[PDB]
Subunit: 157 residues, 6 copies
């Protein structure tokens, strides 16, 4: 039994995230999406809302489950008997910062990190830029799962 | 069930490569090291020598095997019933170049690529730089497995 | 009838920015400098506009306007669909690439990047303000008028 | 009377290149694609020119010409002083920045960079040829005509 | 005769910083570690604590001394009759940012900056990441000098 | 007595190189410029021509001397009782490749490397691009020392 954790705030989940989830679920026996709860910055969607949106979008992935997490990521990973993290990367700058984090996580807890390159179509989408664009009436419907877009239009009204 | 291919020319394999092999073998049920040969340019080591040096330094990894090939990596991967490549990266520059090859490989064959960050200790070792330094007499004994170092010095002498 | 928009906060405009404006004005019939209203900086929007107008008096095909909201709406409402932005580093390119691709996706607005003049590789509004605040001489990095205005805000 | 030159070896032209040509043609009155003569590639200069002309038939303000020597001389001899070049990565920007600054220094010719369309992030003439040589399907990455021509060179 | 200044906030000093100090002290007749304080934002450690932690881990470097300051680094450097800054770098991203500050510092005051590449083992340690990991209970004992680690845990508790 | 080696092919020396030489000579008691002899690629100027051009350009630097070298750079450095290299850097990409080399040189011989950021004015000049531009009649006189430019015009006729 192999497995990996896919961490993020997912506020909201985007099609770029979903592409990573699908690719991880195709290669590991189990995948856990870890939705981070951050006591400091409370974003647009509640943790439960974020989990619901991810579950809707990943309904066809039976070996993927969604859970909330808090604190040190490598504790979350090890408490679930795993020792791999899977994350998506878009740029070389992304890789430099994430490499530091990955080496740190491997040093402190023996947890490894596997990165996957973004699908070309989603190279420019992020949760933050999608929210910003949508806030001013830009159309981000092609960048988000169908249900997320509906939920996002409600938060904006 | 799960599996990945670790590709390279491995001319010769380094401790950086071995670290990647070990980490892939810890996370996938089977790992194949693909020694990719250019039929139009001989390297320093013959295919048999490259394979022998890898086998001698991976004897403790029961789910790893070593095979050579040429042509498209994605054909090597698919003909073994697999759909994943695992590659080590050191730098952001590495990532931008490998991203392009990864996206091409996914485009033409649906094969995914997972990258892993180098161990810090091997951030500066490459087959090419180790060969160049050794050619001019520098001490590279700590960067190569025992199965490689003196065979390398032999080739140079 | 070609045209492009040069966006920024310009707080204050530097010689790096001016170089980009001049180069955009040399290649497009119409240039609009778009000054962001983002409501915490040093100069008011009006002051920023004035400083740019002062420094671009020799560019007959350039005008300066403020705006809020999506840049692509600013651009499209003026009948244009190009943005001209200056870049210093590869890091800059990676971040601006994402914005550029988003802007093209949502509004069909293209982005043209121009490399910084070598002499202004290290110049930014932020660093100029910081250095001047602690007494450093930035007079060679800012339009003559801007510099005097900056001294006034600090004293 | 605005204008820009789009330079390259184009061996062969890809959909990435074509995207850049279309975007240059939308923003400048005149575009010249400059095909480098560099005397070792797959297609002759004439074949490369033909392939680009075939693929740009819907761009009335674009023409295709070959050239040798300094790009800035090609540009200036045609009365222009802008180059439009597509970029994929930050690494690309760092290398092209140096060329751009050199070209501005020696000839006053400016360079405008445009970000790759997302769909063509991984497309290059070199990689397309390599993949096709070993049997990979690159038909979605090249103009329809180019693709058939490529099959012909390999078979 | 020759000399350089090694600047930073050192909140706290790490083994990466100490490596830079040692390498600067090996190549310049005198080295001054400049602990730069923001009078408007307190860090984790007071100035006296930062200086004490550096002194305790540099006692074997006879030509190094530690002083605090604020405002323009180039003024700190020139008022000591020096004209060189020595700074460690980990990444290409680091280099682009530090290049801009170095060129500004040379412009306004004629002060030069020499960069040195991180030791591989410390490629992933930073004061900020060590503090964040420790805040959530991760083991950072191997990344910080003895003069720092338990004082850090004390601050957090 | 402190010191450093400034290595390169210098074919020909440019104003960017000279700026690095000046800055090194200002901070180290002695500087040796090492002009590399490469048996494979014989460039535009002979080693003796390259040395002569550098000596002309550095006439005002009494603590800098110019010598040819061959083979492993760290041997050249240590044979002269030194253990520091000084090199100029223009970009983040430069730093990534040079960092590998610097870590390798420190690993194999204990020789350190100090990098300096290019002067802004010379960010785009290199020996290779200057030669290429000049070959086709471009004016590179503002990028090269006065004497080099004269010598370059002769090699081109
Ligand atoms: N949002 C988002 C996102 C996350 C991961 C990757 Cl690889 C691509 C993306 N656009
Ligand atoms: N050689 C080599 C090598 C290969 C992969 C990684 Cl991650 C690190 C390395 N030094
Ligand atoms: N400020 C500023 C600035 C803006 C654009 C460019 Cl290309 C260079 C700069 N120094
Ligand atoms: N080939 C090619 C190509 C050229 C320019 C751009 Cl921006 C993208 C590409 N794929
Ligand atoms: N912290 C820290 C640090 C500082 C400088 C260098 Cl080169 C490496 C580091 N890890
Ligand atoms: N040529 C050359 C050169 C060498 C070093 C530096 Cl820092 C800048 C340059 N232009």
């Amino acid at each position: 039994m192999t497995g990996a954790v896919c961490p993020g705030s997912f506020d909201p989940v985007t099609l770029g995230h979903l592409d990573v989830f699908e690719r991880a679920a195709a290669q590991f026996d189990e995948v856990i999406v870890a939705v981070l709860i951050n006591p400091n910055k409370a974003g647009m969607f509640t943790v439960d809302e974020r989990i619901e949106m991810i579950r809707e979008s990943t309904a066809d992935l039976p070996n993927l489950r969604v859970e909330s997490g808090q604190g040190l990521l490598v504790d979350f990973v090890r408490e679930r008997g795993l020792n791999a993290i899977v994350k998506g990367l878009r740029t070389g700058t992304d890789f430099e910062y994430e490499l530091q984090m990955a080496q740190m996580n491997k040093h402190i807890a023996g947890v490894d990190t596997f990165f996957v390159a973004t699908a070309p179509a989603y190279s420019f989408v992020s949760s933050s830029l999608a929210k910003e664009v949508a806030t001013y009436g830009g159309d981000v419907s092609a960048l988000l799962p169908a249900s997320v877009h509906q939920r996002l239009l409600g938060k904006l009204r």
